[PDB]
Design an enzyme around this catalytic site. Structure first.
Site, PDB file in Angstrom:
ATOM      1  N   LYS A 143      45.595  25.837  25.695  1.00 35.66           N
ATOM      2  CA  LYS A 143      44.754  24.725  25.085  1.00 35.66           C
ATOM      3  C   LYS A 143      44.746  23.521  26.024  1.00 35.66           C
ATOM      4  O   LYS A 143      45.802  23.149  26.516  1.00 35.66           O
ATOM      5  CB  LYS A 143      45.236  24.346  23.684  1.00 35.66           C
ATOM      6  CG  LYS A 143      45.231  25.473  22.664  1.00 35.66           C
ATOM      7  CD  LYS A 143      45.831  25.103  21.329  1.00 35.66           C
ATOM      8  CE  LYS A 143      46.029  26.319  20.456  1.00 35.66           C
ATOM      9  NZ  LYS A 143      46.640  26.011  19.129  1.00 35.66           N
ATOM     10  N   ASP A 197      46.041  27.502  13.993  1.00 32.25           N
ATOM     11  CA  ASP A 197      47.149  26.822  14.685  1.00 32.25           C
ATOM     12  C   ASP A 197      48.370  26.832  13.748  1.00 32.25           C
ATOM     13  O   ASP A 197      48.253  26.993  12.528  1.00 32.25           O
ATOM     14  CB  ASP A 197      46.707  25.404  15.052  1.00 32.25           C
ATOM     15  CG  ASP A 197      47.763  24.600  15.753  1.00 32.25           C
ATOM     16  OD1 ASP A 197      48.262  25.124  16.793  1.00 32.25           O
ATOM     17  OD2 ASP A 197      48.064  23.481  15.244  1.00 32.25           O
ATOM     18  N   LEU A 198      49.573  26.656  14.338  1.00 31.44           N
ATOM     19  CA  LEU A 198      50.803  26.624  13.542  1.00 31.44           C
ATOM     20  C   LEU A 198      51.275  25.175  13.348  1.00 31.44           C
ATOM     21  O   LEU A 198      51.351  24.681  12.211  1.00 31.44           O
ATOM     22  CB  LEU A 198      51.887  27.509  14.173  1.00 31.44           C
ATOM     23  CG  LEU A 198      53.043  27.851  13.214  1.00 31.44           C
ATOM     24  CD1 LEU A 198      53.843  29.003  13.769  1.00 31.44           C
ATOM     25  CD2 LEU A 198      53.945  26.672  12.894  1.00 31.44           C
ATOM     26  N   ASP A 199      51.688  24.514  14.426  1.00 34.00           N
ATOM     27  CA  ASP A 199      52.399  23.243  14.295  1.00 34.00           C
ATOM     28  C   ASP A 199      51.428  22.170  13.801  1.00 34.00           C
ATOM     29  O   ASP A 199      50.381  21.903  14.413  1.00 34.00           O
ATOM     30  CB  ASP A 199      53.050  22.870  15.628  1.00 34.00           C
ATOM     31  CG  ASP A 199      53.850  24.007  16.249  1.00 34.00           C
ATOM     32  OD1 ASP A 199      54.787  24.495  15.565  1.00 34.00           O
ATOM     33  OD2 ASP A 199      53.602  24.399  17.417  1.00 34.00           O
ATOM     34  N   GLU A 251      43.001  23.344  12.973  1.00 32.23           N
ATOM     35  CA  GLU A 251      43.748  22.612  14.011  1.00 32.23           C
ATOM     36  C   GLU A 251      44.077  21.188  13.562  1.00 32.23           C
ATOM     37  O   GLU A 251      43.335  20.588  12.812  1.00 32.23           O
ATOM     38  CB  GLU A 251      42.960  22.536  15.318  1.00 32.23           C
ATOM     39  CG  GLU A 251      43.350  23.619  16.293  1.00 32.23           C
ATOM     40  CD  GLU A 251      44.660  23.326  17.021  1.00 32.23           C
ATOM     41  OE1 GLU A 251      45.239  22.207  16.820  1.00 32.23           O
ATOM     42  OE2 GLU A 251      45.084  24.206  17.802  1.00 32.23           O
ATOM     43  N   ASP A 252      45.179  20.645  14.115  1.00 27.26           N
ATOM     44  CA  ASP A 252      45.577  19.261  13.918  1.00 27.26           C
ATOM     45  C   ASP A 252      45.541  18.454  15.215  1.00 27.26           C
ATOM     46  O   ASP A 252      45.929  17.301  15.176  1.00 27.26           O
ATOM     47  CB  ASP A 252      47.003  19.142  13.359  1.00 27.26           C
ATOM     48  CG  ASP A 252      48.047  19.609  14.363  1.00 27.26           C
ATOM     49  OD1 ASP A 252      47.838  20.672  14.986  1.00 27.26           O
ATOM     50  OD2 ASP A 252      49.092  18.898  14.542  1.00 27.26           O
ATOM     51  N   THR A 307      55.950  21.058  11.951  1.00 22.14           N
ATOM     52  CA  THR A 307      56.698  21.177  13.199  1.00 22.14           C
ATOM     53  C   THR A 307      56.081  20.341  14.326  1.00 22.14           C
ATOM     54  O   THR A 307      56.748  20.165  15.359  1.00 22.14           O
ATOM     55  CB  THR A 307      56.847  22.644  13.586  1.00 22.14           C
ATOM     56  OG1 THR A 307      55.591  23.271  13.360  1.00 22.14           O
ATOM     57  CG2 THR A 307      57.970  23.282  12.800  1.00 22.14           C
ATOM     58  N   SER A 343      48.364  30.170  18.113  1.00 20.35           N
ATOM     59  CA  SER A 343      49.329  29.150  18.491  1.00 20.35           C
ATOM     60  C   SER A 343      49.718  29.297  19.968  1.00 20.35           C
ATOM     61  O   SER A 343      49.899  30.378  20.490  1.00 20.35           O
ATOM     62  CB  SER A 343      50.570  29.185  17.587  1.00 20.35           C
ATOM     63  OG  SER A 343      51.503  28.169  17.976  1.00 20.35           O
ATOM     64  N   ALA A 344      49.838  28.133  20.609  1.00 21.68           N
ATOM     65  CA  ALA A 344      50.385  28.005  21.966  1.00 21.68           C
ATOM     66  C   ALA A 344      51.906  28.175  21.995  1.00 21.68           C
ATOM     67  O   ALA A 344      52.503  28.262  23.067  1.00 21.68           O
ATOM     68  CB  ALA A 344      50.004  26.651  22.509  1.00 21.68           C
ATOM     69  N   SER A 345      52.549  28.167  20.822  1.00 19.10           N
ATOM     70  CA  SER A 345      53.995  28.076  20.789  1.00 19.10           C
ATOM     71  C   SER A 345      54.692  29.436  20.921  1.00 19.10           C
ATOM     72  O   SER A 345      54.449  30.357  20.138  1.00 19.10           O
ATOM     73  CB  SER A 345      54.464  27.402  19.510  1.00 19.10           C
ATOM     74  OG  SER A 345      55.888  27.418  19.409  1.00 19.10           O
ATOM     75  N   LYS A 346      55.634  29.520  21.860  1.00 17.17           N
ATOM     76  CA  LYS A 346      56.466  30.706  22.009  1.00 17.17           C
ATOM     77  C   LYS A 346      57.400  30.882  20.800  1.00 17.17           C
ATOM     78  O   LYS A 346      57.957  31.972  20.617  1.00 17.17           O
ATOM     79  CB  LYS A 346      57.326  30.604  23.273  1.00 17.17           C
ATOM     80  CG  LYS A 346      58.407  29.514  23.281  1.00 17.17           C
ATOM     81  CD  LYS A 346      59.114  29.298  24.629  1.00 17.17           C
ATOM     82  CE  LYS A 346      58.204  28.889  25.767  1.00 17.17           C
ATOM     83  NZ  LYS A 346      57.688  27.514  25.553  1.00 17.17           N
ATOM     84  N   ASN A 347      57.571  29.830  19.998  1.00 19.11           N
ATOM     85  CA  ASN A 347      58.391  29.868  18.807  1.00 19.11           C
ATOM     86  C   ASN A 347      57.576  30.253  17.556  1.00 19.11           C
ATOM     87  O   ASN A 347      58.142  30.252  16.451  1.00 19.11           O
ATOM     88  CB  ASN A 347      59.086  28.513  18.639  1.00 19.11           C
ATOM     89  CG  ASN A 347      60.075  28.296  19.767  1.00 19.11           C
ATOM     90  OD1 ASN A 347      61.049  29.040  19.859  1.00 19.11           O
ATOM     91  ND2 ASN A 347      59.820  27.321  20.640  1.00 19.11           N
ATOM     92  N   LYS A 393      49.891  17.005  21.524  1.00 22.96           N
ATOM     93  CA  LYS A 393      49.696  18.032  20.502  1.00 22.96           C
ATOM     94  C   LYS A 393      48.786  19.143  21.046  1.00 22.96           C
ATOM     95  O   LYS A 393      47.784  18.863  21.703  1.00 22.96           O
ATOM     96  CB  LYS A 393      49.118  17.423  19.223  1.00 22.96           C
ATOM     97  CG  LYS A 393      50.027  16.488  18.453  1.00 22.96           C
ATOM     98  CD  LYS A 393      49.359  16.004  17.167  1.00 22.96           C
ATOM     99  CE  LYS A 393      50.309  15.153  16.371  1.00 22.96           C
ATOM    100  NZ  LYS A 393      49.679  14.506  15.204  1.00 22.96           N
TER     101      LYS A 393
END
Ligand SMILES: O=P(O)(O)OC[C@H]1O[C@@H](O)[C@H](O)[C@@H](O)[C@@H]1O
Ligand code: ALF
Ligand SMILES: [Mg+2]
Ligand code: NA
Ligand code: NA
EC number: 5.4.2.6
Length: 219
Positions: free
Chosen positions: A145, A8-10, A169-170, A16, A114-118, A45
């Site tokens: 997720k 995961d990223l954020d 993961e967080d 983030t 990551s789920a994030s488009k960023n 989250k």
């Protein structure tokens, strides 16, 4: 031995998750919804932008038009994207760069789940792109997720089975996604938020190759 680590990223690579929270809280309050506090944000989250906004609207049993929904998601993304422009390598969480180097040196695959488009932009901001063997595209999975699809995709993108992988993961949603993928989860945060049934570390400095190996060995 495990063959890949699925990140995961954020809230795992950098702080983030804090910025997603602040941006969603601000959005919620602009539309008159006041319940987006840190505790509620544990339900946000890990979930997609669309699911995040829907959860917020649900909180107040609020209904908006489809046009409004699109505009609200865009407003939050535009704000979030401005917030993250000054992210730099100094923002990588403790231990994470070392872990990436140690994984690479030991020929363990590294994938972003990551789920994030960023996500791609943030890895560029943090000078981490070169360490990743693959980035799973969150727009390409059929289910986001807590569905396991993004973790499965990330493992497959580096030629490894999820059952041969660790996921980091967080979030509650993300931990569930890892469990259902077949990969081994190791969370970072509080067991009060993430559960007492998996290995949880208090901060990312604990994510050492040596610790991951031991977790793997113990099941
Ligand atoms: O809105 P984006 O950048 O596509 O991010 C989607 C999701 O990405 C996840 O990594 C975050 O934990 C969520 O909080 C966020 O909603
Ligand atoms: F915090 Al993520 F995908 F980066 F859920
Ligand atoms: Mg996260
Ligand atoms: Na860069
Ligand atoms: Na790369």
């Amino acid at each position: 031995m495990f063959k890949a680590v699925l990140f995961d990223l954020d809230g795992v690579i950098t702080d983030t998750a804090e910025y997603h929270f602040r941006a969603w809280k601000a959005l919620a309050e602009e539309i008159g919804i006041n319940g987006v506090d840190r505790q509620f944000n544990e339900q946000l989250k890990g979930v997609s932008a669309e699911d995040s906004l829907q959860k917020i609207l649900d909180l107040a049993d609020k209904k908006v038009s489809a046009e409004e929904f699109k505009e609200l998601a865009k407003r939050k993304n535009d704000n979030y994207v401005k917030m993250i422009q000054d992210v730099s390598p100094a923002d990588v969480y403790p231990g994470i760069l070392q872990l990436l180097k140690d994984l690479r040196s030991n020929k363990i695959k590294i994938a972003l789940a990551s789920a994030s488009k960023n996500g791609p932009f943030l890895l560029e901001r943090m000078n981490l792109t070169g360490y990743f063997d693959a980035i799973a595209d969150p727009a390409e999975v059929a289910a986001s997720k807590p569905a396991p699809d993004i973790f499965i995709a990330a493992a497959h993108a580096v030629g490894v089975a999820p059952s041969e992988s660790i996921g980091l993961e967080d979030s509650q949603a993300g931990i569930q996604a890892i469990k259902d993928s077949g990969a081994l989860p190791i969370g970072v945060g509080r067991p009060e938020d993430l559960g007492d049934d998996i290995v949880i570390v208090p901060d990312t400095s604990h994510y050492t190759l040596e610790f991951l190996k031991e977790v793997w060995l113990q099941k």
